[PDB]
């Protein structure tokens, strides 16, 4: 778990804005930028998988998720749902209807939905805590810092942004290392193709 | 002689001959086109591919059995002594109604197919007498 205070402190130090009195960058701006960074980080690395198992009937037809990034598996009464669409097809094959963070089934059928998806748990207060591995700290800083360096404070801000991009790439490499060590098999040989 | 030892000896004989009868049924399934396993068939059909089965050993068994169809062996009898000839030339005339019956070639070709596909060949004989002292 990462506290927001330490991310904020590192960003303030890096922006030469570690002054309690002045705060040229408002904390609302920093919290919004941290939300954006959490968005991008959780989308690119698929950090947070969530499972929701609800029921849809004729009364309520939609399943309201929260902070949706992507759906990787849908079951309806232990039956695979195959295609995804946003158009509300009248009849045909059974598809999953996505309505911008509302989930239903296109040629509607009474039943239950077991959906696997991805989530943010974004923050709104400086005293909150980000439920992410500590290795994700440097990728949060260097990603939110590139978002703020492009305020035209200095004539050489974009070269500094370019340097921070490489630093961010290295941080992402570290994060990928961690994720592979956690959630991946410890294998050393491949399997023969069986057809 | 009663049901108890008949059931127990049938169980002992059937359980110790199951690993060979399973291979016999596998061999008869492989001879009749069923050559792919269920998981391989599923892996092929999930890619939208038509599973092609080359039954390359059915033609081998058919070639060996085609050699055996026309080389059907009969057994003739020869006399040991000189006085046994009138016996043997009698019995060789009496084996012809056993040779040229309709079931003989069918039983021999089924025997050779069972001996080649699997390992067993079983042929039974009977002494049926229908109505006219025959």
């Amino acid at each position: 778990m990462i506290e927001v205070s330490e991310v904020i402190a590192k960003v303030r130090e890096r922006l030469n804005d570690n002054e309690v009195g002045n705060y040229e960058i408002l904390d609302s701006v920093l919290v919004e930028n941290i939300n954006q960074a959490l968005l991008k980080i959780c989308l690119e690395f698929r950090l947070k998988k969530a499972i929701t198992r609800s029921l849809i009937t004729e009364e309520e037809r939609f399943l309201t998720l929260n902070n949706l990034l992507g759906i990787e598996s849908v079951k309806l009464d232990k039956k695979e749902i195959e295609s995804r669409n946003t158009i509300e097809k009248d009849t045909g094959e059974l598809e999953l209807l996505i309505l911008s963070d509302r989930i239903s089934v296109t040629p509607f059928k009474i039943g239950e939905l077991e959906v696997v998806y991805y989530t943010y748990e974004e923050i709104r207060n400086i005293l909150e805590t980000i439920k992410l591995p500590k290795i994700c700290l440097d990728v949060l800083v260097y990603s939110v810092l590139c978002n703020l360096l492009e305020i035209p404070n200095n004539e050489t801000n974009f070269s500094v942004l370019a340097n921070y991009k490489q630093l961010l790439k290295l941080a992402k490499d570290n994060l990928t290392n961690y994720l592979s060590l956690m959630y991946s098999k410890n294998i050393h040989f491949s399997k023969v193709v069986r057809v | 002689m009663d049901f108890t030892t008949l059931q127990n000896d049938f169980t002992n004989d059937y359980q110790k001959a199951l690993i060979a009868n399973n291979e016999f049924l596998e061999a008869k399934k492989y001879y009749n086109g069923n050559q792919l396993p269920q998981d391989v068939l599923n892996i092929i059909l999930e890619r939208g591919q038509t599973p092609i089965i080359e039954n390359m050993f059915k033609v081998i068994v058919n070639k060996i059995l085609g050699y055996k169809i026309e080389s059907i062996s009969e057994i003739r009898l020869s006399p040991k002594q000189e006085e046994d000839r009138a016996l043997s030339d009698l019995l060789n005339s009496l084996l012809q109604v056993f040779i040229q019956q309709e079931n003989y070639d069918k039983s021999m070709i089924e025997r050779d197919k069972n001996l080649l596909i699997g390992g067993l060949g079983v042929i039974q004989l009977w002494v049926s007498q229908d109505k006219d002292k025959n």
């Binding site: - | 049924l25 008869k28 009749n32 086109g33 038509t50 080359e54 039954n55 059915k58 109505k131």
Partner: protein
């Protein structure tokens, strides 16, 4: 054509029944050949498990499909 053994003589005879589904039996004759012989002569090439006839079609069918 049905194989049924008689009770006067103890041998099997074949009897013919011309009938229709959901109508009944049109004509029923018993032993219509003076010996009780079935007129049909059948032979199956390549009987297999599940009691089907296999033919020469099934082993050469995937080659034709691939062609």
């Amino acid at each position: 054509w049905y194989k049924e053994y008689n009770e006067e003589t103890q041998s099997y005879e074949w009897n013919r029944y011309l009938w229709n589904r959901n109508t009944g039996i049109y004509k029923s004759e018993k032993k219509p050949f003076k010996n009780g012989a079935c007129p049909f002569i059948v032979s199956k090439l390549y009987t297999d498990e599940l009691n089907n006839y296999y033919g020469l079609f099934r082993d050469i069918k995937p080659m034709q499909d691939f062609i």
